[PDB]
Design a protein around this ligand. Sequence first.
Ligand code: CAT
Ligand code: CAT
Lengths: 157, 157
Amino acid sequence: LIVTQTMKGLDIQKVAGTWYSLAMAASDISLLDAQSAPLRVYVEELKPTPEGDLEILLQKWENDECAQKKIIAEKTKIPAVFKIDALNENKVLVLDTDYKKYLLFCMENQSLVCQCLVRTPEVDDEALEKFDKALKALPMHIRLSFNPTQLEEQCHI
Amino acid sequence: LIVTQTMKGLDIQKVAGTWYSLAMAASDISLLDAQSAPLRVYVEELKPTPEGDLEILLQKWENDECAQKKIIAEKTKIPAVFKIDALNENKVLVLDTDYKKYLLFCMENQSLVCQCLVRTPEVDDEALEKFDKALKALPMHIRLSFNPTQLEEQCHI
Ligand SMILES: CCCCCCCCCCCC[N+](C)(C)C
Ligand SMILES: CCCCCCCCCCCC[N+](C)(C)C
C-alpha cells in the first residue's frame, strides 16, 4: 500500500447520496490523459448497502459515448477500505471526509488514482487544499480539475 | 495579464543551453490532454540571440510523429517578457530562474500554459515546489509531471 492515509472512524452510511468528482489525480499520465482513459471516471452517487458494502454509480467515456456504470465495492475488516471485482482485486481507500462537503478517496492496484469528491457543483478551495496535502505524499504525474459548468455535464464535457 | 509573477533582473544570456520540461500546467484540460494537444511542447534548448531575442528549440507531437520545431520569441521593453509570432501575438513570461537548475515560465494568450524547466533529467523537488507556489495564484485545470526516464525520450514517451 502506497497510500497510508485513511479516515479513522468512518461511517460509510453517512457517505450516501450525490457526489461531484471535482479533481482527479493519478500516478501515471495515461491513467487519465484521454477522455476514454481506463480510470477517468466521474462519480454520480454513492449507495452503501445494508451489510456495509458500497455500491457506486459513475459515468465513463467509452467508444464515443458517456456511459452509465455501476460498481459494488465490497467491505473489508478495515472500515475505510473496500475491494472491487476487477480482474485483479484492487482496493478503494477513503482517506478523509466530513460527509457533508467533501470526500477524498484513492483506488489502487502499483497504480493509483485519487479524487476529491464534493457534494455541490462548486469549487471548494479547502477540500482542494486537503486533496493537495494528501497528495504530496504520493507519486502523482497527472492532475485534473473541473469548473462548475463541466460538473453539471455528463462526463464533465 | 493573469500572470503577474515575473523575474526581476533577468539576464536572458544566462538561460542559454539545454532544458528539460519537467512539469507543465494549463488553464484548460484540452490545452494539454492529448499527446498532440496544441500547447503540449517539450523544451530542448534555449538560444538567446545577440540583440536579446530568444530562440527556442522544442519537440511537439504532430500527426503521429515527434516533430522538431524552432520558435523565436522577440524581446520587449520588459526584460522578462517576450512575444511570439503566432496568429495572435501571445506573450512568454519568465517568472523565476536561478539559471543553473530551474526556470519557470508561462505563455499566455485568456489561455495559459506554464512549465517548470530543469537543467538535468532529475526530479528537482525544490523547483517543483517553486512551480506549485507560482501556480496556486493561477487558474490551472491540468497538471503533468515526467520521470527521469521519460525526460530522456523524444516527446517524453
Ligand atoms: C468512497 C469513494 C469510492 C468511489 C469508488 C470509485 C471507484 C471506481 C473504479 C472504476 C472501475 C475501474 N475499471 C472501470 C477500470 C474496472
Ligand atoms: C523562457 C522559456 C521560453 C520557452 C518558450 C516556450 C514557448 C513555446 C510556444 C509553443 C508555440 C505554440 N504553437 C505551436 C501553438 C504556435
